[PDB]
Amino acid sequence: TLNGGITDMLTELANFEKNVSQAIHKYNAYRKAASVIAKYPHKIKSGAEAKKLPGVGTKIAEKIDEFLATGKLRKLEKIRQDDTSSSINFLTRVSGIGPSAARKFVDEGIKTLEDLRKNEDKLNHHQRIGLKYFGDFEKRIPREEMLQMQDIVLNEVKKVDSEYIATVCGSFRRGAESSGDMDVLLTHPSFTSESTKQPKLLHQVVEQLQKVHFITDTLSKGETKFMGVCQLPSKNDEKEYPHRRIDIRLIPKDQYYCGVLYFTGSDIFNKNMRAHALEKGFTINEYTIRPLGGVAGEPLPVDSEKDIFDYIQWKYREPKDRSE
DNA sequence: CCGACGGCGCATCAGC
DNA sequence: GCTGATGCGCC
DNA sequence: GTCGG
Ligand SMILES: [Mg+2]
Ligand SMILES: [Mg+2]
């Protein structure tokens, strides 16, 4: 990419503030700056040029002048040398280990992959599975594999009840050639904003995917959200596919468009769009868009994703243009 | 200068 | 047991 | 860390 050196720098700074400093707004600031620079169509010549972009301020502009001048950032060079910071940053790469547990493990002298493996009894269930599939979960999923996965999920959901609709969202719906995981939006006519006319709607689908050995592990599960592990079947004699993260979100059928807007993302696109909604006097979640009175009002009618954009005076952006 | 920064599901825990 | 925080995760 | 007012 045109400015990949800079955007990598800012992402590494972002991860430092989140994982080590526990400063979530600096993390968001860095990631917003990284995103706006990533889609800037010119090779950046100076911090001043970057500062013209929204989300890039004086401090990042200075860092960008240092990086352009030398190819590196002393502040990051120092961080890479700090053992506590390096340890904490590594541990947070395990699913279920966040900034707080990472610092706690380091305190207890648990700071390497070998440390984790011989202390599995100190991990909660999520963390145990995150450690189990540590290597697999850092691999990306080719779109060709995502298509196979889509076919299995949609056909197995159909077998449970022909009235389910499963939509693959996330980066896959944005047209990405590789994804970090699979995100599945699920609806059923029995589950609306007005009534839940049938229990276990999510459970039945999860069970069926487990029965056919597609879902292999559960990280968490409730009435509307499943987070777990899945795996494509492999053919005779060939190596197994890596295990993959799968999220399933059951959304009220009448709120499909808000739900598919949310689950298509990107995460940064959602933060940008919801912030713009607020500036326009609305609030958007995965169910509704409501006016601000500063208390939310009643949900506004929505019959398309585009209706949501219209409310906040944004021209419509197809999924493939939401990769911020 | 300084308040706000998107919004929410599930797991875990503390206090009652 | 319930309620409310907090941690971690999803986009 | 950046922005808006
Ligand atoms: Mg995804
Ligand atoms: Mg996901």
Calpha distance A175→A141 (Å, rounded): 13
The tokens for A115 are 């440390």
Work out whether the CA dihedral A269, A274, A279, A282 comes out positive or negative. positive
Longest distance between any two alpha carbons in chain A, whole Å: 63
Calpha distance A2→A40 (Å, rounded): 8
Of A236, A262, A288, the last residue of a domain is A262
Q: Give the angle subtended at the CA of A181 by the CAs of A178 and A182, to the nearest 5°.
A: 100
Residues 6+ apart with CB under 8 A from A186: A157, A164, A165, A166, A167, A201, A202, A205, A248, A249, A250, A251
DSSP sequence for A288-305: -EEEB---B-PPPP-SSH
Strand partners, A296: A292
Burial class (CB in 10 A: 0-12, 13-18, 19+), A143: middle
Domain of residue A129, CATH code: 1.10.150.20
Query: Do A186 and A204 fall within a single domain?
Result: yes
Closest nucleotide over all strands to A221 (CA to C1'):
B10
Query: Do A270 and A159 fall within a single domain?
Result: no
Calpha distance A217→A289 (Å, rounded): 34
Residue A161 is part of which domain span?
140-262
CA A171 from chain centre, in angstroms, equals: 9
Could you give the C-alpha distances from A24 to A13, A18, A31, A200, A258, in angstroms and in order? 12, 5, 11, 36, 26
Domain of residue A199, CATH code: 3.30.460.10
Distance A52 CA to ligand 1 centre (A): 31
Calpha distance A126→A245 (Å, rounded): 12
Of A40, A64, A82, the last residue of a domain is A82
The tokens for A216 are 């292999």
Resolution (A): 2.0
Domain of residue A71, CATH code: 1.10.150.110
Residues 6+ apart with CB under 8 A from A134: A93, A94, A113
Residues 6+ apart with CB under 8 A from A126: A95, A96, A219, A220
Distance A304 CA to ligand 1 centre (A): 22
Query: Do A128 and A70 fall within a single domain?
Result: no
A222 Cβ nearer than 7 Å to chain B strand = yes
> Distance (Å) from CA A162 to C1' B7?
31
Method for structure elucidation: X-ray
Of A211, A238, A262, the last residue of a domain is A262
Query: Do A225 and A297 fall within a single domain?
Result: no
Quickly tell me which residue has 């900034």 as its tokens: A99
Query: Do A218 and A149 fall within a single domain?
Result: yes
CA A14 from chain centre, in angstroms, equals: 15
Q: How many structural domains compose chain A?
A: 4
3-state SS, A45-91, equals CCHHHHHCCCCCCHHHHHHHHHHHHHCCCHHHHHHHHCHHHHHHHHH
A56 Cβ nearer than 7 Å to chain D strand = yes
Query: Do A145 and A251 fall within a single domain?
Result: yes
A63 is catalytic: yes
> Distance (Å) from CA A70 to C1' B4?
35
Question: Known binder of ligand: residue A152?
Answer: no
